[PDB]
Symmetry: C3
Subunit: 597 residues, 3 copies
């Protein structure tokens, strides 16, 4: 009678226990203590309650769902996915997650400690899927929330290596949904062809979601894959920290991005990226503004390490029929980034910052301002023509660069015959150091190629740190680019032998509120008079010059040209030199031309 | 006979077990394995040992204390506070923690894994409390240490929403006490009116205490609350990382600070703050110097994200009758901070850095030096008159600003008719970018308003990046401010139309060791002579000028004024221009005035 | 019959259990649930299976190894080392780890949760040891890999305080070996005399190894100890974050370094160091290039806090007979570092950055370039003569400094009569702030002491922020140092009273592509003529000057010297001043001398 009870499933509920024989402790039963924890083993059984061994011919989905459902009913807990086993998933889930191609439905307060491996079975080959889904409805707008759900451990989610079946399909690892206080920590996501590994939030709904100390390895493998971003952050007060991202496929170099930050108060820090096209999108989509407003602000990309083939940070905002998105108050700092070894033009255009047009290619919808890019290093190998500190391809309302080291082909670039951005408040401080890797590679090119509709309230302080006499100019403005209320300077160091330093093809440097200085070579002739004697430029293209001074030595004993010059109404420079002996003098001098500076 | 044993509390101690049937493993009893873990359930029982269910009518305090006391007696371990339950605390603790209004006493090597919720019962309404206390004596000076105590998990400490009863009361979540190697990780502290959530150390006693990945939500709710700082770090080699802080109450905007760093080798990094008055105090109180000395050095505030209503970082030090506090070797970097939407003067004065007078208002006790503020961004909306990069309100022995982006009303500010700080070694590098949000808002205001007793060994390199013709001046020194051994420059860009650029109301720019340059408009007249001809200023206020040069074009054909000028004993400027044709000339020219630069 | 089964080691395998009486759960036995976890207690038994209590007279090694071996055989898991006990190790391991003086052999997928203490017994006194070893062969080249091995918890590894027996011995805590996805988290390593606490990887073999939230306390204690580096990172995609390092021994101040980064894509962040000689080596040893190539790139040292006695970051690379090592793409940012209180020359030369010769002292093997040092603060007390922002002691192919605050004796230093580095692409931006702690201490010293074979493509923009008239010069080039294609400037602020500002002992400033400016005092005499009149320098050492301008006021009424000057063939300066009344004039003027700038 007793023996029957003990051998039955209620047996442990009849064996008494008291902690460490402490007479002050609770008099419990063994089952009570065992009930303090829970694992997949407690649900991975047949209809008679006999345990089933996991394996490639067993679909563990229903058992894991039963475990989640049950623990949810008790107000939460943590379910262990045991180490030393691979648990295969081989069918779709049902109900609310079916509209998301869901496999498992996550529930509030139910954490998963993944110590073993979770693997997708070949049922999923060529099919869409989202492995873990926190939505509870096929329509995310009708979904309830997921709260207090954490996935962590030393285990692995393996996507089975299966290619996408069609470019239009979506695949995801964890979609937390309308997610509040959810996180993934320590998990390795590997061996797939997916759209995302993890998505946080839904159109601004959610908060306090984080991805920390995760690894993402080889998650693009085919030409069918339309696009890949490993973590898409779509709720505020959320971010990615201390993660590792690696791709090996050729396709990843063209399509894969590590992180996207799509809502305010989000961050991407302390991570390492290899083999990707792009580092991070930092954007406000008007279409995603429902949950947290139409502004992406307090956006932080800091202290990351990356080898990429396209652009590191892409900035943007856009509009819908009724909502306008805005991006402001962004900081990009402490990152060390290189374009990996590749042929020129063999991947999307290399850039540290890209100001990206919208998804339809429009460059006149953006509202991007108050961005600080500081204390970063960027490098691109000498052969990579398509590399720039900033590719400025859409309207920009402000971006500030201070104290970076940029070693690539271009500093500021946009292509002519493409977009014509309207640029305001572009600040390039003199503390940005321009590297020399691309010296001698710049035939026919302008280091700062200002291919814009207009530039206002901008500062470009060019400072070279080595010679590059191959370049056509340091900075060039086409006649089509209006320039006003701006400061453009070219420091003289390493420029003595340059034919062109700053070029203004529409003579824009003459503007009332343009403040400019740059070196030029000027031919002068003096009057004959002995003593104090004027020297005048032969050319008459200096009506805009407020002062100029000598950057040349005087090889003569019998006279000296002026140290400094002003101009005249007819566009000549004029200054007072000294003829020890009389005579008409003719000299060619290197001058720093200055306007209002 | 056997049946009786099995059903008794020693039953599990009679059921044999060997790990995975391994014949090489220990032959144990089931109780031995169960004894490897411990939970509140093992102590949450009545005097007959029957388990008690937690709930709002059950006071769990004595049971949790019994658990802590017992595990301590075995040299430590980790007690789980089970998920799926709310455990209410409804009485004060006894003994050493009673002097601290303590609820639970923490003990060395006894960790708490909080997975469920800990809630305060209405017994605590209008009363003081400190929930977890690591002191073992009512007098902290007589207390032993708390060592190796970690509180972690996915659970929650909820303060029940109760208001303070009186402003003089104190409330805290965790007071680790004289704490060595203690930490809180992952916990959410919420729904209260408290002084602090967590305090680390006691007057410099302690080491290696940390708060990581915690959330602090809505911890001020009344006008009775005197003051709130969420984490107060009062031992060295300690800090706060990757935390989230949010307040929603109006009162929090006026009284709440996220962190205070009060001892050397402390840090605050990677955190996000919303709804607070202040970011962090970084201070050395002489009254707190007992355990780790009278110097706060190696203080780090980095890579945080904040929306606040008052000051981001407040620096200070002070004295007692017998001890002098010193603050030095501080770094504030990578932070992105905004003043939230508010009316001018509706919260404490907005600032990125504040040099704060002591608790009695004294501005002549401080010893603050070797501070680096670099690579931060600050923004305040255009209407917020009371916003400054630095409010410099007490004596300052040094602070260095490099490569920040400050977009607010003032750069350097102090109020006239208040304190008169003595300032040394204030360095504002030219790489600080001054934003344009407050353009046109500055009528009657000085961008750098130097309301100090004196300034020495300081550098202010003003560089505008857009026009603001509303401001009275870029930088102004009242006659009461001595200025010596300093460099003050105003770059000409965007200044052509400014009536005043740099203003020295006591003519302080004439000092022997003052190095200055700024733009001015000067009226000149020449002699009649044809050829090389002198031009002289009409005014005689330039006896201090070492050189000047033209920032204006010359619209004339028949003559040119000098490109460059020196001065004369009588205070006139003089230079040599050129009269192609003779005649007295009279011109008004924009000049860069230079002294010793 | 039943009673016998129940009391036997298979007893728990006969007591039934079903989770929380859920009829949908697996019908299990108690043993199945207990088998979900494992501890040292399951293996710490005698040959009859009776548990053995740990203690100082019990060697726990064989039992822990048995536990690891068994769990490995089941595909992994986590073994707990129980809290409340000290587990002593008192013998060497056997097999593959014997060649490494190994104690315990780690195995793939077998994690250790150390909650208690692991202590070395006096068997190890005066002997070599490596406590945990992941190699499986005495020859690391013949070793298999260690994968997915994590050591974590609140516990402690204590090295027993034993001194090294001989300098040639090696001691280590954790050698992960050829290690992929291995980590140590939360552990305190203390009380020893060891070579390393943790090593990651082997000669570039390994990946994704990390040390996080560990403490390292008092790990050098004798003069026998040859060298100590607490963590040596010898695989890529690996790093150290949020750790604490402290030493108290005098010997540690001379020999101990906190971290070494020896492979690409490695990092050291967010850590605090006290009592060490050095912060981090960042190097590529040719001898270590087998697993990951001959380039150390993407090296990050960020946001650390340190008090050290020697050098913070040491850069280097070297060669073997057949392999050349290269170091490039490095970032050092956000660190706050001081040289601790010590006598001048009482520890290795104080430096923020050191360019270190190879292990044989060779300075002509290095290939170091594309290094960015930005946003750091460094301080050394006034008495410490041997303190420098950079000690540049070996060939350097590039290093860029932007926006740092350096407060120490020297900015750039190398000793004369030692190495003669060949320097390229050294960039010192004007945004580096030079502190004043060492003002008045610099008799006979050059702030930038350019003791090199040659300097090319370099920039030194000196900006003082206070006076130091004690120094011999701001920057000095000996005649032995070639200088070409470089920019050297000394801002005039705080220099008026300096006898020497920039010194070129070989007249190197005359080079065709040298761009220089600095202040000097010049004696001039004029001709007698009334009106516009030339002034000429008495000395003829200005043939290299392209322009000069006045930094002095003119105390005269009757004349003015020129505001600006050029030169003549004979090396005189010449400019045009103005004699209101005639007469030969003689003046001594402070000028800014400019060449090509
Ligand atoms: C892969 C990726 O992240 N690409 C981004 C791109 O994102 C957009 O394209 C995606 C393509 O996969 C997504 O669109 C697909 O998915 C949508 C969402 O799926 C439905 O809803 C979810 C919740 C549900 O589980 C599913 O079952 C579906 O029912 C589909 O509606 C759409 O048809 C698909 O093509 C992505 O959608 C977002 O996905 C996230 C994460 O899952 C969700 O949280 C959002 O709700 C959802 N958003 C919307 C509006 O539906 C698309 O947003 C980015 O747009 C670009 C950004 O870069 C570009 O724009 C900026 C700003 O103007 C410019 O600066 C750049 O220059 C320009 O290139 O980047 C890609 O990398
Ligand atoms: C809320 C807060 O942190 N405010 C700080 C302010 O701190 C001071 O005021 C506090 C008000 O709550 C504290 O004072 C109260 O508490 C003291 C401590 O309580 C006793 O001791 C503890 C251990 C015990 O558990 C309790 O039961 C009590 O017996 C009381 O003695 C005092 O009477 C109360 O008003 C705070 O005290 C410190 O608290 C910490 C954390 O608990 C303890 O570790 C310290 O031991 C204790 N220190 C002392 C000396 O007792 C007070 O320090 C700060 O002073 C200011 C700093 O800013 C100001 O000064 C700087 C530097 O000069 C300037 O730059 C600024 O401009 C100026 O404003 O900031 C507030 O935010
Ligand atoms: C203590 C320390 O880290 N010092 C470094 C120094 O490192 C070199 O010296 C070490 C002295 O302890 C090591 O050498 C010893 O150990 C070697 C390895 O041991 C064997 O192999 C291991 C795997 C096995 O378990 C053991 O049982 C042994 O069989 C011995 O071969 C050698 O004889 C010992 O002296 C260190 O070796 C490396 O150790 C790591 C970690 O264990 C291993 O992963 C590597 O395989 C091993 N490397 C090699 C090549 O064997 C030595 O590398 C550094 O060299 C210097 C760097 O600074 C100097 O050089 C740079 C670059 O040129 C310059 O810029 C500097 O100016 C110059 O000073 O720093 C010391 O702090
Ligand atoms: Na869908
Ligand atoms: Na245009
Ligand atoms: Na008290
Ligand atoms: Na005064
Ligand atoms: Na060996
Ligand atoms: Na030489």
């Amino acid at each position: 009678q007793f023996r029957a009870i003990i051998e039955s499933p209620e047996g442990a509920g009849h064996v008494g226990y008291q902690y460490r024989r402490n007479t002050g402790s609770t008099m419990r039963m063994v089952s009570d203590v065992l009930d303090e924890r829970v694992s997949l083993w407690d649900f991975h059984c047949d209809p008679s309650g006999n345990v089933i061994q996991p394996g490639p011919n067993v679909d563990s989905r229903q058992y894991l769902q039963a475990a989640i459902d049950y623990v949810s009913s008790n107000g939460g807990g943590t379910i262990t996915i045991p180490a030393g086993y691979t648990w295969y998933l081989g069918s779709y889930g049902v109900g609310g997650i079916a509209g998301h191609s869901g496999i498992i439905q996550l529930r509030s307060n139910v954490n998963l400690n993944i110590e073993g491996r979770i693997h997708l079975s070949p049922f999923f080959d060529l099919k869409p899927f989202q492995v873990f889904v926190g939505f509870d409805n096929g329509d995310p707008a009708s979904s309830g929330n997921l709260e207090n759900c954490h996935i962590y451990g030393h285990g692995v989610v393996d996507f089975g290596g299966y290619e996408f079946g069609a470019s239009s399909q979506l695949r995801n690892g964890v979609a937390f949904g309308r997610s509040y206080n959810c996180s993934v920590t320590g998990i390795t996501f590997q061996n797939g062809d997916v759209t995302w590994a993890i998505t946080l939030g839904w159109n601004g709904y959610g908060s306090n979601c984080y991805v920390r100390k995760c690894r993402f390895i080889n998650l693009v493998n085919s030409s069918v894959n339309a696009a890949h971003s490993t973590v898409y952050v779509n709720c505020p007060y959320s971010g990615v920290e201390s993660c590792y991202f690696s791709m090996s496929s050729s396709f990843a170099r063209n399509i894969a991005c590590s992180v996207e930050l799509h809502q305010h108060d989000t961050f991407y820090r302390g991570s390492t990226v290899n083999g990707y096209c792009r580092g991070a999108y930092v954007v406000m989509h008007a279409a995603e503004a429902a949950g947290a407003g139409s502004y992406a602000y307090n956006m932080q990309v800091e202290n990351n390490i990356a080898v990429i083939y396209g652009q590191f940070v892409i900035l943007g905002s856009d509009v819908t029929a009724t909502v306008s998105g805005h991006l402001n108050d962004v900081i990009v700092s402490g990152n060390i980034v290189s374009i990996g070894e590749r042929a020129a033009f063999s991947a999307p255009f290399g850039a540290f910052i890209d100001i990206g047009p919208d998804n339809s290619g429009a460059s006149n919808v953006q509202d991007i301002q108050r961005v600080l890019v500081t204390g970063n290093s960027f490098y691109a190998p000498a052969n990579i023509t398509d590399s720039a500190a900033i590719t400025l391809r859409a309207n920009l309302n402000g971006c500030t660069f201070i104290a970076n080291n940029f070693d690539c082909r271009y500093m500021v670039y946009n292509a002519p015959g493409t977009t014509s951005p309207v640029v305001q408040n572009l600040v390039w401080d003199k503390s940005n150091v321009i590297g020399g890797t691309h010296a001698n590679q710049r035939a026919g090119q302008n280091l700062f190629d200002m291919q814009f509709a207009s530039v206002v309230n901008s500062t470009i302080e060019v400072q070279l740190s080595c010679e590059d006499l191959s370049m056509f100019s340091c900075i060039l403005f086409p006649a089509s680019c209006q320039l006003s209320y701006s400061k453009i300077t070219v420091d003289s160091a390493w420029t003595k032998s340059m034919s062109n330093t700053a070029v203004f093809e529409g003579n824009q440097q003459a503007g009332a509120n343009v403040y400019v200085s740059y070196p030029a070579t000027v031919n002068l002739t003096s009057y004959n008079t002995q003593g104090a004697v004027p020297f005048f430029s032969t050319d008459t293209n200096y009506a805009w010059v407020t002062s100029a001074y000598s950057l040349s030595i005087n090889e003569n004993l019998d006279f000296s040209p002026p140290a400094t010059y002003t101009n005249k109404a007819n566009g000549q420079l004029v200054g007072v030199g000294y003829n020890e002996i009389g005579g008409v003098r003719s000299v060619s001098v290197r001058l720093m031309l200055q306007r209002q500076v």
